Every structure is written in structure tokens, then in C-alpha cells.
Structure 1
Amino acid sequence: VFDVRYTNLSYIGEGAYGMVCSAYDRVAIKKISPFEHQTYCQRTLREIKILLRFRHENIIGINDIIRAPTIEQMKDVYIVQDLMETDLYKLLKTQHLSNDHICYFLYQILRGLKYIHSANVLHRDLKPSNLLLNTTCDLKICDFGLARVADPDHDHTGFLTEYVATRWYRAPEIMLNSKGYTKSIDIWSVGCILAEMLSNRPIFPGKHYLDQLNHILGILGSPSQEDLNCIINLKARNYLLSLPHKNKVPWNRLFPNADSKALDLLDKMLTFNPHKRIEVEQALAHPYLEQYYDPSDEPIAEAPFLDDLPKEKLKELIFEETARFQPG
């Protein structure tokens, strides 16, 4: 059932979120049915609240929202967004990208991320399938379902703490001492996306939770004494000290045909210690992106921007947040 002004539906894809179609206003329309679970309501409210406050060329917008006229009759919510042609995940299954496509797509990811981070927001699930593309090579970041307001003072957690965001794009600190409440979480994922664009393969394809950290240390090598000193947890320190010494796999052996400036930026985004990891503004200013770098054309948000609310209260908040799209 797709009850939506919008006609001639055509299937694009599906996932845990629900189903996404194309339709004539040509737009994208996704049907969300989250009201039976608190977690689904939280993700829906984050997506809506955030995307409605953001206005940026490299961030997907929300054009319209369809739902019943009362809270009692609201069972689904339809979100209308700009139609794109594909995503980076699908493109990388069939095309090897030239360096100048990688450079421009990376520029756009970091331009959008500058804006998100300037609003004090973390995306927390950056990956190729969340980067939408068209034939004119415009790139738009999507899926803010796991987004949060940054909170570096409460980022600390114990060793091997469970995490929801996509495993292959998790920074090493997620497995050691971090809840993913700092902007450095997103820079790591962007580093993983760059590596993936360079070889059409995920750089750190962990098969399970701790294997993710095995893959990261397998390439970066053993962390320095200084980086071990920044690790707060007794258990995380003991674990890292227990491992055999491993030397760093050089970027030019993993990526023998990549541009040397792309590999220098990659090295800086994939820095083990999050305190030493390059920030979004510094990455935009890196020599690899010099042809595109223009701070005057990299806008920021006008002002900065659930866990213990029951699903019923979250449904009322979603109802209120979507009220602006009703007739009159």
C-alpha cells in the first residue's frame, strides 16, 4: 500500500526503514511505519527534525510529508525528497572511478559534512549507500536516523561497548572507549569512503564486532605509546598491550595507483587517535581538494542544533513535527 498529488509509482528499493518509490509531483517517496517500537520512532523523529532544519546543496532535503490528519489514524508517514539516480554503493558495484570523480565526490561529502558539523550535529552512519548521486555528479548525504547532537564531554564508554552504526565504517575508538558522540567519528567514516572509492572494496570489512578492530590495527599497525596514553580504559589498554607488534601497511602498497595527495589526506582521516584526526575544515583545505576549496562557497548552519521518551510521546512529537505539511 502506497497512498500518496503523487502518481505512477516505480520501485527503487527497500530496507528495514520501509520502501522507497519514485513518483510524479518526478520525486522520491519513502513509506515509514515506525509506531510499534520506540527505536523506530526515535530514528524517524531524528530524520525529520534534522532534515527539515537543514538547507544545503549536499544534504538531501525533505520536500513534503504525508500522514493522517489525526494521531489516532496515523499508522504510516510518507517522506518526499528529491529524486536522484543512484548511490555510491551501487555505482562502485559497476564502475571504477577516475581520480577527478573521487576528488569531486570527496569535496562534496566534506562540504556537506562541514555544514552538518557546524550545526553541532553528527551523522554517525556515513557510508556509500547514504551518498546519493545524479548524472551531473551532484552528491547528497542522506539518512540521519542515527544522528545526534555532539557531546564530547559524555563520549566515554567501556571497552567493547555495543554499537548500532554500520560495522565497516566504525572508528577504532568505538570498540575501545567511545560512544560516537564526537565529530571525529564522521571523519573516520569519510576516510573509509575515500579508501573504498580508490579500490571498489571496503578497506576494513570486519566479519563481527572485535574483528573490525583487528582489520583496522592490521593496516594502521600497533598504536604508539602516546596514543595508548590517550586510551582511558584499563581493559582497552591491556588489550592493546597484549597484541604482537604489527607494522603499518603503507598506503601506497594498498593503493598503488592512487594520487599521492589523496593518500596523504586518507592517512590524516584514518588517524588512530581521534584527538589527532583531521577536522572537516582542515580536510577541505588539504592540497588534494585545492582546486575546489573555497570557504566562501562552503556555508555553515545559521545556529547550532529522545532516548528515554516512550513511543507514544515520540508519536505525538512526530505528529507535531509534520503538522506544517497539512492542507491550510
Structure 2
Amino acid sequence: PEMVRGQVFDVGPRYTNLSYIGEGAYGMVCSAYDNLNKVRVAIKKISPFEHQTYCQRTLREIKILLRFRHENIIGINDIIRAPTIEQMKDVYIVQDLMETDLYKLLKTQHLSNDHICYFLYQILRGLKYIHSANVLHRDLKPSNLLLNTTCDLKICDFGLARVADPDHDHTGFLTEYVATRWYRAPEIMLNSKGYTKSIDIWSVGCILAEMLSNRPIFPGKHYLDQLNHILGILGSPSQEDLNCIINLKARNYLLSLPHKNKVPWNRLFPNADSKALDLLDKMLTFNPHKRIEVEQALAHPYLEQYYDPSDEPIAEAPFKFDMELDDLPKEKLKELIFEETARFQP
């Protein structure tokens, strides 16, 4: 088999000329030449079967990415694995090769207003489809937004995604959470499990702010510091917004803080388009019930050049997990991954 930087990368006859690209949130990633379609592609090696947690993330992603079909969501072109469950130690996921991601771009490049607008449009267009299927991404951030050399954008990493469940969103103060800190909505720290769509719009607002300035807007260093960063800019919440928080520990924590006034966006981003700032304000609203939804965001005057609801598809049905998944053993999950990947076997 082909070998790469001290590891087996056996992707068989079809894919050759392997070259290390990096580590994604699963394992090693390599580019390779696809001998059938004659293009270079990206291949991610996943070795998840020695952890119930990795298997769950892997399965969830495979299931979602195979059901979705959309220009702004990364697809799966091929999946490589052994012919039998007994011999299957790794799985290889093959996808279109992208040049870069928004994280790398923001480190190194100033974006024009036209690029910002176009990128934002594509994010929201893909998010419209995801949310129409009743799915929440829950970890939107610059690293999860891939770009090719013509600035086409694709959303990736559906490992933390969930079906929306508004009825079960409530929890106590300071409840643990898994998704990337700087892009977490304020309610996650206060009273929310992140089971509603408004979680994703907050993350998109954070991303917009970062595109405007090249730096993260709420770079909290730990769980609670994330909130003080938010409040220093948005200001103290109103009585009305506090009235929505019924849990006493969360409400009384907020009442204990000194008063902070809002910092107007135009002071933070003096070069920004005023329409971009108006939309940002509506995404970065403290109260999730007052936060703009994806379809309203697409129709905002900032995006008028691109907005076309007839070219902004929705999913054909809501998405559902047949089995629970969360309470399944390793052995079962292995069998399910084997079964889901069968359609790519000769």
C-alpha cells in the first residue's frame, strides 16, 4: 500500500500521487490524483472504531453529507474501506479538493466589501438549506468554511450537528458545551443546550464581524469570559430580555454585573458598509427570540445583488435519525458505518 509521513494510506488503484495537506478534526488529510475523473481530490483518513465518541461523530457526518445535495455544502465523492467488517480498521472519505478556508484567508488577506458580501451570501444560502431540513450545524466558524480558487464557498464538518429540538432547549446556568468557544451564542452559557436554529445565526454574525476586521470579535479565554466579552459590546441586557431568562442562577448572575452601555458598530468598524452593520446588529442580538432568521437575512438590503429565492433551494424533506445513536455501543456503530458506506463498494 501507499505510505505517507509514517502512516498507511491505502486508497487503492483509483487514487495516486499522495501529498500531505494537514490534520483536520478527524485524522490525516492528503490530496491525491483521481485517475477516473482526472482531478486532484482531498482524502481524509478516519480511524474511529476504538472510541464510541469518534464513531458517533463519524456516522452522523456520513449520514448528513450523503443526504444533502447543495452547491454550498461539501459533498462526499467516494468512501474507501475494507470489504468486510472484520478487516475494516479505517475509513477514507474523498471530497473535492479546496484551496483554502476562511480561517487561513483571514490570517493573511484583507477582504474587499464585494468578497465579504459574496461570502456571506453563500454561507446563508447553504444555511437556508441546512435549516430547512431541520438540522443545526452548531459549530460554524471560519475553519469550517472552505474556499476554492474562484471563491466558491462550501460548509463542512457536520460532526456536532443535531436535529432541532426547541422543546428541550432549556438547561441550567454554566452547563458544559462542546462547540468552539468564540462562536457560541450567549444563551449557551445561561440557559440553552443549543438545540434551536438561532444558535447558528449567532455564529454567522460572529463570522461577519471577523470578515470586517480580520480578528475574532468575542475572543474569550474561558467559559464565562466569553460572556463578558459579548456584554462589553452589546451592553447590559434590557429588563425585557432578562425577563426571558427564568432560571434564577443565570438571571441573578447577570443582575450582579456592573452596567455596560452598547458600543455602536460604526465605532468598531468605521470602514464597513452601513448595510453590513445593520445586518450584523440583527444577527448579534442577545435575545435569541429577537435574532433574525436565515430567510430574513438573505432578504436584507446588504445582499440585494445576490438574493433570488428561486435559486436558494430547500431540502426535499426534514432529516431524521432512525436510531437514536447517542446510546449505541461501539460494535453497533461499526456495523452501521459499514452499512452506510456499502454503496461505494464494487
Residues 31-58 of structure 1: per-residue CA shift (max 9 Å, x gap): 0111111111111011100000000000
Q: In structure 2, what is the Cα distance between the partners aligned to 1:30 and 1:16?
A: 10
| Helix, strand or coil at the partner of 1:31 | strand
Corresponding residue for residue 3 of structure 1? 10
Stretch moving more, 82-91 or 306-315? 306-315
Q: CA deviation at 1:16?
A: 4.2
Query: What is the TM-score of this pair, normalised by structure 2?
Result: 0.93
Alpha-carbon distance between aligned partners in 1 of 2:309 and 2:162, rounded to the nearest angstrom: 25
Deviations 1:206-265 (A, max 9, x none): 101111111111111100111111113111001001111100111011111000000000
CA distance, structure 2, for counterparts of residue 264 and residue 186 of structure 1: 18
> Distance in 2 between the 1:10 and 1:59 partners?
24
Q: How far did residue 15 of structure 1 move?
A: 3.8
Q: CA deviation at 1:173?
A: 0.3
Aligned with 2:287 (options 270, 273, 280): 273
- Deviation per CA, 1:52-78, whole angstroms, max 9, x where unpaired? 000000000001001111112111110
Match of 2:145 in 1: 131
TM-score, normalised by the number of residues in structure 1:
0.98
Q: Give, in whole Å, the separation in 1 of the partners of 2:224 and 2:55.
A: 29
Please, what is the CA RMSD of the aligned residues? 0.7
Q: State the partner residue of 1:24.
A: 33
- Measure the CA separation in 1 of the matches of 2:196 and 2:25: 26
SS in 1 for 2:114: helix
Match of 1:209, SS?
Answer: coil
Unmatched segments (≥5 aa) in structure 2: 1-7, 35-39, 319-324
Choose the corresponding residue for 2:92, options 70, 75, 78: 78
The 1-side partners of 2:270 and 2:330 are apart by 51
User: Secondary structure of the residue that 2:224 maps to in structure 1?
Assistant: helix
Once residues 34 and 227 of structure 1 are traced to their aligned partners in structure 2, the CA distance between those partners, rounded to angstroms, is 43
SS state of the match for residue 21, structure 1?
Answer: strand
Cα distance change, pair 62–255 in 1 and its aligned pair in 2 (3 A): same
Q: Which runs of 5+ in 1 are unaligned?
A: none
SS in 2 for 1:7: strand
Report the Cα offset of residue 96 of structure 1.
0.6
> Residue 293 of structure 1: SS of its match in structure 2?
coil
Q: Distance in 2 between matches of 1:43 and 1:277?
A: 29
- 3-state DSSP class of the match of 1:157? coil
Once the two structures are TM-superposed, the CA of residue 122 in structure 1 deviates from its matched residue by: 0.4
Counterparts of 2:311 and 2:59, CA distance in 1: 30
Measure how far apart 1:12 and its partner are.
1.3
* Matches of 2:164 and 2:80, distance apart in 1: 30
Which 4+ residue blocks in structure 1 deviate beyond 3 angstroms? Answer: none
Q: Secondary structure of the equivalent of 1:283?
A: helix
C-alpha distance after superposition, 1:260-311 (max 9, x if no partner): 000000000000001100000000000100110000000000000x111112
Is 1:322–2:331 an aligned residue pair? Answer: no
Q: Deviations over 1:3-26 (max 9, x none)?
A: 100000111110441011111111
CA–CA distance in 2 between the matches of 1:297 and 1:191?
A: 23
Taking the aligned partners of 1:156 and 1:39, their CA distance within structure 2 comes to: 24
In 2 relative to 1, CA 15–133 (structure 1 residues): closer, same or farther, beyond 3 Å? Answer: closer
| Offset from partner CA, 1:104-159 (integer Å, 9 cap, x none) | 00000000000000000000000001000012110000000000000101111111
Q: Distance in 1 between matches of 2:172 and 2:87?
A: 43
Task: Sort the Cα spacing of 1:282 and 1:120 in 2 relative to 1 into closer, same or farther, 3 A.
Answer: same
Q: Please give the alpha-carbon distance, in whole angstroms, between the structure 1 residues aligned to 2:246 and 2:326.
A: 25
How many residue pairs get matched?
326
Point out the more displaced range, 67-76 or 154-163: 67-76
- Supply the distance in 2 between the matched residues of 1:232 and 1:105 (Cα, whole angstroms): 37
